[PDB]
Amino acid sequence: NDPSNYQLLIKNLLFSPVAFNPEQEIVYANHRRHSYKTFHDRVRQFANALTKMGVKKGDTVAVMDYDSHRYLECYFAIPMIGAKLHMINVRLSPEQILYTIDHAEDDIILIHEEFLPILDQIKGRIDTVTRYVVLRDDEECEYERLLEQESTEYNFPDFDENTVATTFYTTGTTGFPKGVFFTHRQLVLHTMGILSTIGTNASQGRLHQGDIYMPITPMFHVHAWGLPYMATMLGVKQVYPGKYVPDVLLNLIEQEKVTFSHCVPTILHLLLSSPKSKAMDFSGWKVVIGGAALPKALCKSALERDIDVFAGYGMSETGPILSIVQLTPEQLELDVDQQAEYRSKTGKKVALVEAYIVDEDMNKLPHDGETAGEIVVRAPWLTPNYYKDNKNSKALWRGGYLHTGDVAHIDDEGFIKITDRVKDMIKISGEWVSSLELEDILHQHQSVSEVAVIGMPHNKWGEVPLALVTLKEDAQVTEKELLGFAKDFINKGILAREALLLKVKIVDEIAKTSVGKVDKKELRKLHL
Amino acid sequence: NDPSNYQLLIKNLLFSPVAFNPEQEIVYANHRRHSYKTFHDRVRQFANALTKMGVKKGDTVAVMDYDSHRYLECYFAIPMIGAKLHMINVRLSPEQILYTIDHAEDDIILIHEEFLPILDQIKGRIDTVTRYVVLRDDEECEYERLLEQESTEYNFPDFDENTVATTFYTTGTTGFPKGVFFTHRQLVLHTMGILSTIGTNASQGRLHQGDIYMPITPMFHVHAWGLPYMATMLGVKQVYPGKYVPDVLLNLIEQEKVTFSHCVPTILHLLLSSPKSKAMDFSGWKVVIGGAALPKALCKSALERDIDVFAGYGMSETGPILSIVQLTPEQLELDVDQQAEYRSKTGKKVALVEAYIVDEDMNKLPHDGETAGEIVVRAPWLTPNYYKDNKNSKALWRGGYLHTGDVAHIDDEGFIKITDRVKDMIKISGEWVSSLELEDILHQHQSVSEVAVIGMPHNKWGEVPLALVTLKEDAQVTEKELLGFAKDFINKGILAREALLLKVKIVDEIAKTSVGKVDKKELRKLHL
Amino acid sequence: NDPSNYQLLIKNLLFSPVAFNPEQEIVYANHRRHSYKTFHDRVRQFANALTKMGVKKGDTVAVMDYDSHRYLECYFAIPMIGAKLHMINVRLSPEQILYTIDHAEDDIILIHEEFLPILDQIKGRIDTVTRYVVLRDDEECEYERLLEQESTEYNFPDFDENTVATTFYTTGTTGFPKGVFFTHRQLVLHTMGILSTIGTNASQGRLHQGDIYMPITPMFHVHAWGLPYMATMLGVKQVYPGKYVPDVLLNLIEQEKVTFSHCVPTILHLLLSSPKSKAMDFSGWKVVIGGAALPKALCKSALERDIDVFAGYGMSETGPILSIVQLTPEQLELDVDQQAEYRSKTGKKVALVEAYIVDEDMNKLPHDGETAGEIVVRAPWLTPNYYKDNKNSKALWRGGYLHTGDVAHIDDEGFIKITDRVKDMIKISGEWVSSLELEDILHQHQSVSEVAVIGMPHNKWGEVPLALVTLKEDAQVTEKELLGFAKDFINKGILAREALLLKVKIVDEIAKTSVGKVDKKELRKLHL
Ligand SMILES: CCCCCCCC/C=C\CCCCCCCC(=O)OP(=O)(O)OC[C@H]1O[C@@H](n2cnc3c(N)ncnc32)[C@H](O)[C@@H]1O
Ligand SMILES: CCCCCCCC/C=C\CCCCCCCC(=O)OP(=O)(O)OC[C@H]1O[C@@H](n2cnc3c(N)ncnc32)[C@H](O)[C@@H]1O
Numbered sequence A, B, C: 001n002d003p004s005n006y007q008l009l010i011k012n013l014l015f016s017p018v019a020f021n022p023e024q025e026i027v028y029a030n031h032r033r034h035s036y037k038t039f040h041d042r043v044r045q046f047a048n049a050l051t052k053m054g055v056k057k058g059d060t061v062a063v064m065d066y067d068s069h070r071y072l073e074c075y076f077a078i079p080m081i082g083a084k085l086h087m088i089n090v091r092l093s094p095e096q097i098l099y100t101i102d103h104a105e106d107d108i109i110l111i112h113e114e115f116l117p118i119l120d121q122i123k124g125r126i127d128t129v130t131r132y133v134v135l136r137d138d139e140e141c142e143y144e145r146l147l148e149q150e151s152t153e154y155n156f157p158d159f160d161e162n163t164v165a166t167t168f169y170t171t172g173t174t175g176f177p178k179g180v181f182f183t184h185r186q187l188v189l190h191t192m193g194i195l196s197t198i199g200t201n202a203s204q205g206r207l208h209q210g211d212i213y214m215p216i217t218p219m220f221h222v223h224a225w226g227l228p229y230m231a232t233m234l235g236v237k238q239v240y241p242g243k244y245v246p247d248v249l250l251n252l253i254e255q256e257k258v259t260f261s262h263c264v265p266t267i268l269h270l271l272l273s274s275p276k277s278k279a280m281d282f283s284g285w286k287v288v289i290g291g292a293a294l295p296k297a298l299c300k301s302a303l304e305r306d307i308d309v310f311a312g313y314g315m316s317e318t319g320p321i322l323s324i325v326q327l328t329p330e331q332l333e334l335d336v337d338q339q340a341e342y343r344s345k346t347g348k349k350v351a352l353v354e355a356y357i358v359d360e361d362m363n364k365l366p367h368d369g370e371t372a373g374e375i376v377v378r379a380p381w382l383t384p385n386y387y388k389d390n391k392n393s394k395a396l397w398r399g400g401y402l403h404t405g406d407v408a409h410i411d412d413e414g415f416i417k418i419t420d421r422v423k424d425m426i427k428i429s430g431e432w433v434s435s436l437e438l439e440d441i442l443h444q445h446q447s448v449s450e451v452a453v454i455g456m457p458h459n460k461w462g463e464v465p466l467a468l469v470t471l472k473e474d475a476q477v478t479e480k481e482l483l484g485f486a487k488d489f490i491n492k493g494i495l496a497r498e499a500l501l502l503k504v505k506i507v508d509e510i511a512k513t514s515v516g517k518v519d520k521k522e523l524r525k526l527h528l
């Protein structure tokens, strides 16, 4: 390697950070506390231990645990040695987990004790795995004992910046999970170029060197939104809660004085509604709600607690971060409502992102704020293709751009607002109607629990929508009333107001995926 | 080019910024005002005009003017088309300028009217130049007329990120100026990784999206410290003063409400001592004094005016930025003095910088804060070699590291303090003594104007120091008194206190280079 | 290397010559005499000494001395080891010498004692030079002492025949000197193909194995016209005079019985006009006057002394030899005058030379002897380009041919006669007039010392000529008389006879370059 030819490697994020305080703390909730010097020593020890296990540059190490110092150490030691880090979604079914393990061809598996029963249904069909390391919170952890036998000195290799570092096997609508992968260069550029955008904000929604970081995301989904890398590059204090219990989360936020975190709307709603939060000071917190479609009512309610709530956008193929809501100081004088609308949007695109809006022919629809279309992006941290896929990869990068699958409109000043998914469009007549606004209208009904809208195919009118609704306790509302209730509203195009073929139906239950999202694909098969 | 293979190009800094306000202003002092949309249109127009002139990817365009919107437009249009941008140091002698022009083989020269007489001494010996464009501040500017005939639509090329973009021909101690060069990738990484460090500071010395930028640097030295790129990436307001007159500078700072600037100690001293600054509010200003060795007394005096003064470090081979003074909130409670010492240091190394201290055998001396040595660095934005040089290039990158030429010590917490130059070391006996502290001691004398210390070679004691001093008005102090005056001080090692062979001498004048720096090399030849 | 694949190397010129007499003498004037066996031993010793100094294949060794056995030994030992030989023009200014040394990046410098003061003005700004060897004519020479410590046995390497051997940095009209370079193959082909032409002449102007060679050229200009190589290949006696004093030159010619030499018109005129030459037998001498434009009067005067005077042509980019005057036995019966005209011409092209005449559009003007045009040549010993130059190199080889810069006409039988330079053409009207014939007409005036003609630009008539003349002692001739004196002559085209805008002016002095040639470029700037 030419010393004058600089390679962008993950080890430079750790050993050449923005700031490095040797006495800054890393805290695993009520279990462990150490310093950044101890963290570096443990990273070197884990590198030595992995080298002893026969792990080489091309190997793959799979991880299965919660959010802890161990996961943070795996985020660095495994990529630095050159091997690939496979984050297993522990929320998938055991069959899908087995498929992902077989597809990735893992060599070492680091699994928490609480996930052992799942492995009990899968270990029999697992090949290519030579060692299982059981992680525990007590003294009998195999990871800690393996660390104890190794020295704290290690000379980390130099390799090409285009070597793969992480894979985590997203699961969309394909029938099988799809492998996504990133290199050292992409991760370094991601953290650098998002720190250069979020950190340069004037007064709102900025992460700086004086914060205290705390993930409330699974940390195996999308690299925990890349935020652990940014937090360790800033040399900030990091707190890891573990199993995401609302009471212990609130206690940790109070005691550790957490000021920056990121979350999904469900856990945020559970922490705001907790009785322990009624007498808790929240005017130092900077939650980023970028999971999926931060509701306006939840954002308002959180703003009344003096919480800096803003939304971000990701995909799991795109870094993941593509856009973040940033408010100008003029926009910070709005009272509670216009701020609620602005903060719940998709946000403006981050540095080094193109983010055009196109249609089915890739025609780059204008940014008038009313014309909806698919989002299509270019960024320095996108997956070139799906692992071991050809035609899905070709469909992913159709037309020289990465296809997102989200239908949105971009307004004049640049604010993005996602309206629907590509596959969930009611392509009624020749128009493209979104099923989200119909669901929201029907959800507002007093005697309605959950609403799902499905496109029923027609001879004419293209395909028409069919509504599936679940009622509340001791509630019995006829189908005609629900049809009429939607007809009450106004401001809809096409035939009258798209209220002639709503076809609302009662189901007792609505099918959901293993994560808890409405499985519209299975709803089709059941009803048509 | 593979669309999934992202190239780091300068056009992405302009068209994919952190923030973009179309109505944000670019102001050339009392001459011109336009918006960012107009700036983009003018960049496209200049691209068209350069294309009409026959400028191709491998061509070189040389620029000679002050700080204006024209220089900012040249910072973008010329690199985007692929050609190289040659910044000519207008402070050099005409012979050195001719040498640099001949060495770079410029094709188009953009020269201000006020620099025409210099070209009158050099145009006769100039080859390879096919067009001269005369820049004026009035309506008769050739640049403006060339812009007026072109359209505001242009499709910018994609090329490799390793294509050269800028050259500016630094002049150290070589006998001839040395060519330095950078690529698109290096500049993009420089701006991104310095925004990610300076912008993430908690409360002190940060540049954010609400500032107002104003260069007080020649803008041809080192890319104006790379700050125009950072300012345009943030979509901030930029003000360009022109000829650097203290009165107009103060007027511009007052009227335009400038909050961020960078400067050298001389211009800062002239703006603090100006009578117009006595009744001027300076408590919004964030000068970065990284030119050369910000004095402690000047920093104190500036701190009493409530100015956020801090120092940075550069070389002209290194991006240039390598280290910046950053203060923790604990350090911000010091009154006026300890803050003066901290703010005048070289500073801590920025993100993605190694910055070891070594000796003549490259042994990596420890960071105890007392052991001095040469600074040696690795960074993503260093020059691989000197242009059209082999052995100077080999000496630049000796031992797999870039050699700086500065002798400094690094303390425990990471603060760098530069003590001297490599070639200005009194290698007395076997020790390495710095000539800066001897100059400071002799400069403190009441009847002393300027002191230069030169190493006179000895048979034994290695080489001994010889002092050249200029006296003040109506001052006549004997050599013996000056020798005794230095002997008064204490805390010096080696023989007694290195006061037995000071060899102070009176000169009437001391030779200086074309910039205004003491030319120690010529002092040798004159005296030995 | 394949032994059946023969490489044309300089070592074959020495070790496989046409003739080799071990007892043949090499004489340095009144200082040293040795034999060819001693010369070979000294070449091997110098190879050993250079190897001890760390000189490798890619290194460069620079030489600065007069004509001696040392220069002849450097002509062989340095190229044979593989390194490049840099001949420094000691007649240049110290600044130009410094520029050439820095550009060539010399490692070892061999400098005569008498050239030490020049180095005293330049050594301070010299880099890349690790050793200085001082050459002396006494016993204390460092070169001789270095030779004395080495053995006379050495095995010379085999390398590609396209490896560079010599560079000498010609200085035309560029603003900076231009680097020219040749390979082993080119030098071997040059000596072979010029020996095959000049040696095969019937009775006049031939160099054979019975001659005695003596250079009267600086020996650093153009390889001394390549004649030392030819002389050592023939195994002939060689005499080196040193400092070119006319008295010692005549004494050496008389005592050593020199029969072949080459010279420039100035030294020839000084040796013919010397009082010691009045009683000296010159009917064995074969001077080649190929420096610049052998005058007809000087050639006549030399022919009355029974000297075989003939002219040759070179450039310093072309081997240098391109054409030599050769007389058929029919032409040898002319009395004194027609022989004077024939011998002073440029001559017929030598073997393996194309030598067409072209115009500004490269149209290959006919060889009618009246139509003038630029000389354009192809030969096996031309420089492919200028060292470290791109656009000057492109202009040198424009149109697939090497551009000479001389304007000449070629007659039917093949005789070339150079009329002017390309840049010195009065492009009056649409015609191309030569300034040499106007200078000759004005020089003939009794009260005229030196005449220079410069083209003054006009609105119409293209550009008109302006004459600068210096008068003799106690001579005062009005401008009108000089204008009328030129009008007396006849046989000139265009308007009347190109006598309406002569614009003769008196200067006291006329600027000359460092060599002693009229600097027309500076004359422009002074007068227009
Ligand atoms: C400056 C230092 C501090 C930096 C702060 C970092 C901000 C991070 C903000 C959030 C990034 C979003 C991360 C989510 C990644 C995707 C979640 C994942 O597990 O992926 P999956 O493929 O299952 O789902 C992707 C899918 O979700 C939808 N979606 C995601 N975010 C959305 C928002 N904000 N709004 C609407 N929809 C959103 C999309 O359908 C996407 O394709
Ligand atoms: C058979 C064994 C014996 C061989 C005899 C060898 C015959 C050698 C005859 C002479 C060759 C000419 C050598 C001169 C090389 C050029 C001199 C030099 O130092 O180059 P520079 O670039 O300064 O000048 C080149 C320039 O000079 C003019 N010029 C040269 N020769 C000329 C003649 N004969 N007539 C007119 N002009 C001449 C040209 O302008 C040329 O470009």
Ligand SMILES: [C][C][C][C][C][C][C][C]/[C]=[C]\[C][C][C][C][C][C][C]C(=O)O=P([O])([O])O[C][C]1O[C](N2[C]=NC3=C2N=[C]N=C3[N])[C]([O])[C]1[O]
Residues within 6 Å of the ligand: B170, B171, B194, B195, B197, B198, B199, B206, B207, B221, B222, B225, B227, B230, B262, B288, B289, B290, B291, B292, B293, B294, B311, B312, B313, B314, B315, B316, B317, B320, B321, B322, B324, B346, B404, B405, B406, B418
């Ligand atoms: C975040 C956003 C914002 C950003 C900001 C930025 C900052 C910047 C700072 C500063 C940097 C620096 C620059 C400078 C460069 C250089 C100059 C030039 O021109 O160069 P040259 O001439 O080559 O020089 C170099 C030298 O100098 C010196 N220095 C510098 N600096 C310094 C010094 N010293 C001491 N201190 C300091 N600071 C050295 O010697 C070098 O080498």
Ligand SMILES: [Mg+2]
Residues within 6 Å of the ligand: A170, A172, A315, A316, A317
């Ligand atoms: Mg996804």
Ligand SMILES: [Mg+2]
Residues within 6 Å of the ligand: B170, B172, B315, B316, B317
């Ligand atoms: Mg420098």
Ligand SMILES: [Mg+2]
Residues within 6 Å of the ligand: C170, C172, C315, C316, C317
């Ligand atoms: Mg020449």
